[PDB]
Design a protein around this ligand. Sequence first.
Ligand SMILES: [Mg+2]
Ligand SMILES: [Mg+2]
Ligand SMILES: [Mg+2]
Ligand SMILES: [Mg+2]
Ligand SMILES: [Mg+2]
Ligand SMILES: [Mg+2]
Ligand SMILES: [Mg+2]
Ligand SMILES: [Mg+2]
Ligand SMILES: [Mg+2]
Ligand SMILES: [Mg+2]
Ligand SMILES: [Mg+2]
Ligand SMILES: [Mg+2]
Ligand SMILES: [Mg+2]
Ligand SMILES: [Mg+2]
Ligand SMILES: [Mg+2]
Ligand SMILES: [Mg+2]
Ligand SMILES: [Mg+2]
Ligand SMILES: [Mg+2]
Ligand SMILES: [Mg+2]
Ligand SMILES: [Mg+2]
Ligand SMILES: [Mg+2]
Ligand SMILES: [Mg+2]
Ligand SMILES: [Mg+2]
Ligand SMILES: [Mg+2]
Ligand SMILES: [Mg+2]
Ligand SMILES: [Mg+2]
Ligand SMILES: [Mg+2]
Ligand SMILES: [Mg+2]
Ligand SMILES: [Mg+2]
Ligand SMILES: [Mg+2]
Ligand SMILES: [Mg+2]
Ligand SMILES: [Mg+2]
Ligand SMILES: [Mg+2]
Ligand SMILES: [Mg+2]
Ligand SMILES: [Mg+2]
Ligand SMILES: [Mg+2]
Ligand SMILES: [Mg+2]
Ligand SMILES: [Mg+2]
Ligand SMILES: [Mg+2]
Ligand SMILES: [Mg+2]
Ligand SMILES: [Mg+2]
Lengths: 142, 98, 129, 117, 57, 69
Amino acid sequence: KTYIPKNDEQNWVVVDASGVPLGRLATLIASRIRGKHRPDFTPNMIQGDFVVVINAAQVALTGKKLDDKVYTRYTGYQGGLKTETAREALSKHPERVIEHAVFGMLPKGRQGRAMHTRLKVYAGETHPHSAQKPQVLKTQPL
Amino acid sequence: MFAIIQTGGKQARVSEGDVIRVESLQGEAGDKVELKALFVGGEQTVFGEDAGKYTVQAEVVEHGRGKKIYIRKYKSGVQYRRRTGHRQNFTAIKILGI
Amino acid sequence: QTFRNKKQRKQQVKLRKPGFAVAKYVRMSPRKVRLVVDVIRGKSVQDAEDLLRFIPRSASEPVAKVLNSAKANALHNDEMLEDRLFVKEAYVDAGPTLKRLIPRARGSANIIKKRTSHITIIVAEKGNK
Amino acid sequence: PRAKTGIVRRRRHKKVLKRAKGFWGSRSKQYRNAFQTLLNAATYEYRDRRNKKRDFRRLWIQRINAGARLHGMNYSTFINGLKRANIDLNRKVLADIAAREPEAFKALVDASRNARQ
Amino acid sequence: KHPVPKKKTSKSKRDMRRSHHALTAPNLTECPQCHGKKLSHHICPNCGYYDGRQVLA
Amino acid sequence: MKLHDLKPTPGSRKDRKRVGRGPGGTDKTAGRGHKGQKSRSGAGKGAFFEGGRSRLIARLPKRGFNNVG
RNA sequence: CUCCCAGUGACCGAUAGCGCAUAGUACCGUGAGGGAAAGGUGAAAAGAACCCCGGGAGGGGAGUGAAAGAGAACCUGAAACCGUGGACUUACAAGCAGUCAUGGCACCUUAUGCGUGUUAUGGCGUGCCUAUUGAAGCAUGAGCCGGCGACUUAGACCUGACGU
RNA sequence: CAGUCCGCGGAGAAGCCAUACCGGAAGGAGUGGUGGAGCCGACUGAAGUGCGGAUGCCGGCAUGAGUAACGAUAAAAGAAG
Ligand SMILES: [Mg+2]
Ligand SMILES: [Mg+2]
Ligand SMILES: [Mg+2]
Ligand SMILES: [Mg+2]
Ligand SMILES: [Mg+2]
Ligand SMILES: [Mg+2]
Ligand SMILES: [Mg+2]
Ligand SMILES: [Mg+2]
Ligand SMILES: [Mg+2]
Ligand SMILES: [Mg+2]
Ligand SMILES: [Mg+2]
Ligand SMILES: [Mg+2]
Ligand SMILES: [Mg+2]
Ligand SMILES: [Mg+2]
Ligand SMILES: [Mg+2]
Ligand SMILES: [Mg+2]
Ligand SMILES: [Mg+2]
Ligand SMILES: [Mg+2]
Ligand SMILES: [Mg+2]
Ligand SMILES: [Mg+2]
Ligand SMILES: [Mg+2]
Ligand SMILES: [Mg+2]
Ligand SMILES: [Mg+2]
Ligand SMILES: [Mg+2]
Ligand SMILES: [Mg+2]
Ligand SMILES: [Mg+2]
Ligand SMILES: [Mg+2]
Ligand SMILES: [Mg+2]
Ligand SMILES: [Mg+2]
Ligand SMILES: [Mg+2]
Ligand SMILES: [Mg+2]
Ligand SMILES: [Mg+2]
Ligand SMILES: [Mg+2]
Ligand SMILES: [Mg+2]
Ligand SMILES: [Mg+2]
Ligand SMILES: [Mg+2]
Ligand SMILES: [Mg+2]
Ligand SMILES: [Mg+2]
Ligand SMILES: [Mg+2]
Ligand SMILES: [Mg+2]
Ligand SMILES: [Mg+2]
């Protein structure tokens, strides 16, 4: 009875990150990926836009978080324990920090893996994807 | 385009031949004139108590029993299994109102 | 183009099995026999004649003889042309099983399965395609 | 009079095996496990038939606030504005079909928003 | 002591195990000095030529 | 009559109790409980601590008349 | 009373019925003693001349026959279980094996549908029985399919319900 | 299984096999395919009358698996049949 559509759309957008809190921006990207902004036409299919973050290395952590925030990740090995990289020294490879947020909120299933594809972090002011002609979208939500 | 709101009848800007729950007017006699809360006639959308102005007729087409279903129920370690038959009566109608 | 009943069809159409041969009760494990029977299958009946002859298994003997009978009744009985013939079909199913007692330590016996084999092959003209 | 089980049992068995025909492994071919898988199958059947309304209600609402925010309102404010005018009593599913027809949806959005003022 | 397998092994996983028992067809090749086929770096069984005739038969 | 029209009076014959025979009626245990002396017959009628015992005053014969009102 | 004979049966009909469709044999035991599976061409043998591949065994033709979709491993020939072929599928997947939903492919003989087979993705989801205060349990039983397998009978009995 | 009806059947019974049909369920029909000689429906009567379990019984077939082994470490090799 209910309308469903084809996945015919493929849409590209450049989120900015400079001065934005992490998490605040991250939920916006997770919502755009998971498809809520368009009439979320199905659970079944990933109709979200492709999301190209820039200047991610200017990301803001609004507390004391730049220190004392931690990044535990287990290498299977004993003593491979909480291999804690934690801080702004993780801004030695800034982009993954942001990924790790939105993937913290993207679904954990087969599809939920597969959407992380469309996340295109870029810590610099420049990105390759001019051929996609991504569309601007503002960090303030309303 | 538009559809019955199941709760009894009542719907919007359609033109088709749809099933719905039984009508207690038998035959093709009913000629049911239902009220509708929305319409896109002329692509001119109209809704609200504007749609208490407009009304659409539709002949009754056929009484009917839907496709069968069993009602099965289970609970663990208690013996207790249950099984029952069921089919839902309906009265398919075709639309031709304003 | 069809008869009254099955009682008449049984009298008038006698149903033949072109290309067909089967070797029943071969005292061998089928499991072993299919190992070669897969190699043969789908191939030119001369390559079957040659394959079967160097593959180094005891099971290659009975699977050899049947193949000839397939080609034999492909040619004597069925008018087929041997430069067309090929192994359209080959399979082995299990026949009956000789069971034997075998003594084992501390006074227990066991039962032991001497499986038999029903090898079967169906050659046909490579006129398909 | 003797009266052996005979044909009865195997009728019953084949019925079960015939209900169980999409099933993997011996959930499809042995009776015992076929009948056992069908036990939990009955449970899950009777659950989903009335949970499916929950899921579809979710999908309707989830599609409605999308166009709501597309216009700069949202589901809570938009249905409160379609309620604040008494005359809108259509089901959420029909608001979805309207969300698939943008012009009428925007007409209802401006109608609703002219009722929380 | 005395390990045993736990649950009976299923048809499907058994077949994945046997996935490697596929036989390797000999690389046959026809004798230049005869009709029939012969294994490479061996004498032709039918003729007996490895270059002249080598085996008796 | 014609004898295949014969039927005994309604409710003049009730069917048996097929105690056993599974979950549509009277299942795992038949009517019997879980355990206890519900197993195979034996005990009769007595409380199996004490008899409810009272004294006896005792005599042996009698000889009644037939009655005519 | 019934080794034995006849007659009869809301008795059995090849796991039933005597243990035996025959056998107190085979087999087990020094011994006293224990102790099996059972069956079915076809009307009639007309029981397959003859030819083909193979030492055979087995098979394909031909004939006989109503049927060889009966051929002597000879009524039917269910299930587990083993295969051959074809549709759809499957090699970043986490999974009581299903349940509902949506899509993709295939097909149309109670069947062009509120379809059948399959399938991808989404959501959902602690085998069964038993014994338990409490069971997915790492508590018991169980390899799987078949088939045997447990609330009966008796009596000039006692007691209740219903019916005549 | 029995009594009594109604019948069916070598233009083919039961049984077996598919099946989207039917009743509220136990179930029961339609059509097709084997099968080849007995059998359905209604009313009544009697039962050895409905199985997943009992480390149940008789039976067949799986898994372990082409795995462990092939029964003394007194070895065997060439020709020829
Ligand atoms: Mg309980
Ligand atoms: Mg003839
Ligand atoms: Mg046998
Ligand atoms: Mg559920
Ligand atoms: Mg040890
Ligand atoms: Mg009762
Ligand atoms: Mg108990
Ligand atoms: Mg107790
Ligand atoms: Mg006693
Ligand atoms: Mg007493
Ligand atoms: Mg017997
Ligand atoms: Mg038997
Ligand atoms: Mg005896
Ligand atoms: Mg002897
Ligand atoms: Mg023979
Ligand atoms: Mg035959
Ligand atoms: Mg036959
Ligand atoms: Mg014979
Ligand atoms: Mg006969
Ligand atoms: Mg037979
Ligand atoms: Mg993949
Ligand atoms: Mg895995
Ligand atoms: Mg549970
Ligand atoms: Mg306890
Ligand atoms: Mg357990
Ligand atoms: Mg155990
Ligand atoms: Mg007496
Ligand atoms: Mg009385
Ligand atoms: Mg017939
Ligand atoms: Mg049926
Ligand atoms: Mg006859
Ligand atoms: Mg009979
Ligand atoms: Mg019994
Ligand atoms: Mg039980
Ligand atoms: Mg059992
Ligand atoms: Mg056994
Ligand atoms: Mg090894
Ligand atoms: Mg070894
Ligand atoms: Mg040894
Ligand atoms: Mg020697
Ligand atoms: Mg010499």
